[PDB]
Symmetry: D3
Subunit: 144 residues, 6 copies
């Protein structure tokens, strides 16, 4: 119902190529949840290195893509970043990688706001491919 396409994304997040890893927002409810898509394509620059002969989307970039999806939720819910402010990744708990994500996968990511605590915001994220979980993690993010 509340979808954002890439130009709307570019207006919210400061990330640019080759480190903008949210391709679409499928739905969100402010202060609660956001569901985003990362299309995984062979034609992405990290796959040349990771690895030659055997393309594997880096687990660390799933954590990043989910953190980005929290940022989009945070900005739509609480206000846009002001010029020069940034959205800092502060911590991660319990990241678990279940199986490799590969070219052709459409990675569906769901992030949920948990609480604010200290000047940090805590989110959970779950990433799926073809309805199955490929990654979970709990993420802490802060605006400076």
């Amino acid at each position: 119902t509340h979808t954002l396409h890439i130009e709307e994304i570019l207006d919210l997040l400061p990330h640019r190529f080759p480190f903008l890893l949210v391709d679409r927002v499928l739905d969100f409810e402010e202060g609660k949840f956001l569901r985003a898509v990362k299309n995984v394509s062979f034609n992405e620059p990290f796959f040349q290195g990771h690895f030659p002969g055997k393309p594997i989307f880096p687990g660390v970039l799933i954590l990043e893509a989910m953190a980005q999806a929290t940022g989009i939720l945070a900005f739509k819910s609480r206000g846009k970043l002001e010029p020069g402010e940034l959205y800092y990744f502060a911590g991660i708990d319990e990241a678990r990688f279940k199986r490799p994500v590969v070219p052709g996968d459409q990675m569906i990511m769901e992030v949920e706001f948990v609480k604010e605590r200290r000047g940090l915001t805590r989110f959970t994220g779950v990433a799926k491919v073809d309805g199955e979980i490929v990654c979970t993690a709990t993420m802490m993010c802060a605006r400076s």
Copy 2:
């Protein structure tokens, strides 16, 4: 039933980054048809240039990706390329671009063998997004 993932694709086509534009094969029947996926992601290198502020997947790259999908069909059907042989794009008729393809689109491509003619092979292709046609073309390819 007959799916090929990226490693199988890399073994068939000689194209490499940043010009390998088939991410998966969903089905095929040798000598007849092939259905392939190109995942369209913001994190592809041509989107920096095409265009700043407004990402549009180039129509010429839809033609490329379909031509590559003919190559995979041709190789699986007729034999792999020999070292130093190439799969040449010889011509295109009636390419039509119906609307823009954008980050987050999964472009489903169907190619069909038509006939061989004067040392050339003729194919038709149709590319879809969300079940709607975004491009059609007739393609002529040759080995040499």
Copy 3:
């Protein structure tokens, strides 16, 4: 007589790296024709992929470069793009690729306005290397 160098080109076309494929305009007459140069260098990013061991300038990028050269004609003849407007590739007829274009080739391209029809503009293009034809095509372009 009416030459445009790259900064003038950058002011007319919205394309940027790695998808700006017109390096110079040698001559033009508004509403009629334009003659442009694409220098083909090994140091272009697509050649890593197309193909390892055997650099071949992609035919699809000749079509693009010619379409770009039509855009430059269109903008100089009829007015510049307004912010957010774009120059859409709508169709191609009868693209023919005669032989491979390679590193060291200076690709001379000549585009001619044919007619407007529906809200499309029709152009013919011919690309030469060392005075010989390497590609022809008829292109349809539209401003949205």
Copy 4:
């Protein structure tokens, strides 16, 4: 006393550009610890995107670089990877990012083997700049 330069690293790890994030090994003791350097330079490709006007080395890439440093320890200690085998990132606990790492920083990373557990190996890592901690994490890695 036990230093490895980049060619020795390239022979141990399968990662390549733009995802090989260990530039040198300063010391190690098989089965115990490894100390590595990641030089952080503006001329790295992710800084274009992260972020325009404000270069910040991604925290997720500090985790990657430390995971790579565990791989080098694992290979030197336990044996090189066999062709087609991979060094998989299975999980992370308690990653904490203490302050931003920036161009001109030399990031010194110390990884320690903790134990093997259910087919996984557990490692702790600590990354420093100018003697101060910028990141800690506990990492689980597996061969397959």
Copy 5:
């Protein structure tokens, strides 16, 4: 005492990725000298080409990095570039390359103003790694 970090550098020099080769300024005295750092990392794009299997930082890029460091001195000492003006490399005398610079090296560069002569400014530069000289040169630079 007078250090400049990368955002200050980006405000002074017009160079951007992949050709900004000064990561930090350690000290300077206007009109006299400047001491700068170039961190040499495997993750820089030229190392893919220079050379496969054997990363060697190009000597020509040491000359560039030093010329950049002269520009930063020139701008801080004599005034910033005005929009559209540029800082031209006009000549080099007696460049000498002593040994290869490699991934993991922190290249410390010291440039000294010699004199102005014609509308050129003459500088000497010396680049060190681990306290040893790896390159010297005399450089002539001009503002247009």
Copy 6:
């Protein structure tokens, strides 16, 4: 009469993208001279950084390209490099840059063998555009 195209060049020089800067050899006489072409195209990766809004081919890359052209002469004249051997740039005298080289320029480079001296070989080079000199230099190169 003695021309070498890119595949012949790739077999002689070890440089690869984005640091192979000789696109064709127009003529040569072993032990004496070589004339090579570098096509200068906007679609080269360094132009993004050098400079935004104003593309200028770096003078240091003219020196590189001429050094590469000496390498091709050296290999054709004296023997190919053995695996793991490199063609080292040892020094430069009297490099002079006469005016900017820009997208659309075809840079014609003439290198001449001067003499061997203390385990080094000395060469002169002259680079032209449209028959006019844009750069001269004396280059010292060594195998090791």
